[PDB]
Design a protein around this ligand. Sequence first.
Ligand code: HEM
Ligand SMILES: O=C(O)Cc1ccccc1Nc1c(Cl)cccc1Cl
Length: 462
Amino acid sequence: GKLPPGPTPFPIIGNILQIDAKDISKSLTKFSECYGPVFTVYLGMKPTVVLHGYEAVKEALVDLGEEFAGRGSVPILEKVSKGLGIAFSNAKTWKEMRRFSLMTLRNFGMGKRSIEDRIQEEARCLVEELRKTNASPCDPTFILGCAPCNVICSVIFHNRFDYKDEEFLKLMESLHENVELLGTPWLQVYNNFPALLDYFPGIHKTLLKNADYIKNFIMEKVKEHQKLLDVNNPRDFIDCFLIKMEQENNLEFTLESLVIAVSDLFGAGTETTSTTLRYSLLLLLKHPEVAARVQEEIERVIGRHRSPCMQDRSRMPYTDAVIHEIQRFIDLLPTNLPHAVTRDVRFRNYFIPKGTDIITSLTSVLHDEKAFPNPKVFDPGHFLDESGNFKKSDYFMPFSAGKRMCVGEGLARMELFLFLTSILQNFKLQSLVEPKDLDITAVVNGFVSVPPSYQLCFIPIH
Ligand code: HEM
Ligand SMILES: O=C(O)Cc1ccccc1Nc1c(Cl)cccc1Cl
C-alpha cells in the first residue's frame, strides 16, 4: 500500500504552485533533495510518481520495464493518434507498431539503399545549401530543420524535397506550429482542466488543421506508393507497411494506422534532431577548441576528399565523445516523455496502482555529478579515457531506456555524426560575438530544451 511521499498538494490544483513554470526539472530536483529518489507530485488531482537519480530511473525503466512500459498522459496529441501509432499508443497496438518500426528502421531494413546512404545524400544537400549562404551571417534554424525532416521523408517516402519546396516547408511549418502549440513539460495538464481549453482554444484549434495537413501530406504519398508497390522489393517504410497489410492477419495495420505511425516518427524525429544539431553548432561556437579538435580528427581519419561514413565513427573517438557530450549536456528532454504503469506494482517499499503517471528525470541521470564530474560543464573528456579512447557510460541516457526507449535512436545518432562531420569538414564556424558573450543556456519550450537564438557564418574550407 501507500504512494511515495511528496509535497503537500493544495486542493484541486495540486503541487502546481510549487513547480517552477520555466524549469520543471529544477523543481523536481529540489523536491528530491527532501523527499528522496522516489516521490509523488500532483499535476491537478491525479498523482504522478517521479523517479530521480540513475538507480530509481534504471530500476523502473529497465528492471521493471514491462510495469513501466505504459505511455502516460499526453492530452490532445494522444487523442489525434486515436490510441494508434507508436508514441502515444499502449498495449498490443503499441507492441505491434513498435516491433514493426524497429524492424523496418534498421540501417538496411528497407532494401539496398541503406538509411546511412539516405543520410549521406542529405548531408551533401545540407553542405550545398550552407554554401549558398555565401559565408554571410545566418540563423541555421531553418536549414538544420530541413535536413532531419528530409531524412525521415527519405526513409518513409523514398523521396527528399528541395529546401525551397512549398509543401515541404509547409510540412515543416505544419509540424513546427503543431509541436509549438502543443508544447508543455507537464503534458498531464490537458487531461485535467477543461475550462482552460476554452480560455485558450488557440493552442488546441489549428492542430486539427495542420496535424491534418501532416496526415494529409502523408496519406497522399501512401496512395502513390500503392500503385508502385513491389512486394519483393520494399524501398521505404510505407512499402514495408503496405506489404504487411497485403499478406497480413494484422488488424492493427490499416491506412489510418500507417498515417498516424508516420506522423509520430516525423513528430518525434524532426524537432529533436533539428534542435540537437542547432545546439551542436552553438556549443562548437562556444568552445572553438572542440570544433578544431574534431576537424583535426576528420582530416586525419576521413580526409578532405570523401564524404564521412558510419565506419569512420569507431575510428573517431574524440568526435564520438563530442556528440555524446552535446546530447548529455543539452539534456533535450529533461523529463523524458511521460510514462505510466501498466499494472499495480510494488516499487521498492511503495505501492503504485495501475495507470499511475510516471515522470523520469533524465536530467538527474545525464547530469549525475559522480558519473560526469562537473556535469554542468561541457567537456568531451566526460567520454574519453586517459589514452584518448572513447569511454561509454551507463548514465548516457538521452534516448531514455527500457521498453519505450527512442525508436529512432540509431537513425538520430547517424544523422548527428554524418551532418556534424560533413559540416566541420567543409566549413569553419564564425560567430558574430566572442565565445565569452555567447549565451548557451537552454530555455525549455514545450518538452524540449532549446538553445538561445544565434547567428553565424559558414566559412568554406578550401
Ligand atoms: C537527437 C534526437 C532524438 C532524441 C534525443 C530522442 C529522444 C527520445 C526520447 C527521450 C524518447 C522517449 C522515451 C520514453 O518514453 O521513455 C523518444 C521516443 C521516441 N522517439 Fe526519439 N529521439 C530522437 C530522435 C528520434 C528520431 C530521429 C525518431 C524517428 C525516426 C524518433 C522516434 C521516436 C519514437 C517513435 C519514440 C516513441 C517510442 C515509444 O513510445 O515506444 N526519435 N525519443
Ligand atoms: O508526436 C508528436 O507529434 C510530437 C510530439 C508532441 C508532443 C510530445 C512529444 C512528441 N514527440 C516526441 C517524442 Cl515521441 C519523443 C521525444 C520528443 C518528442 Cl517532441
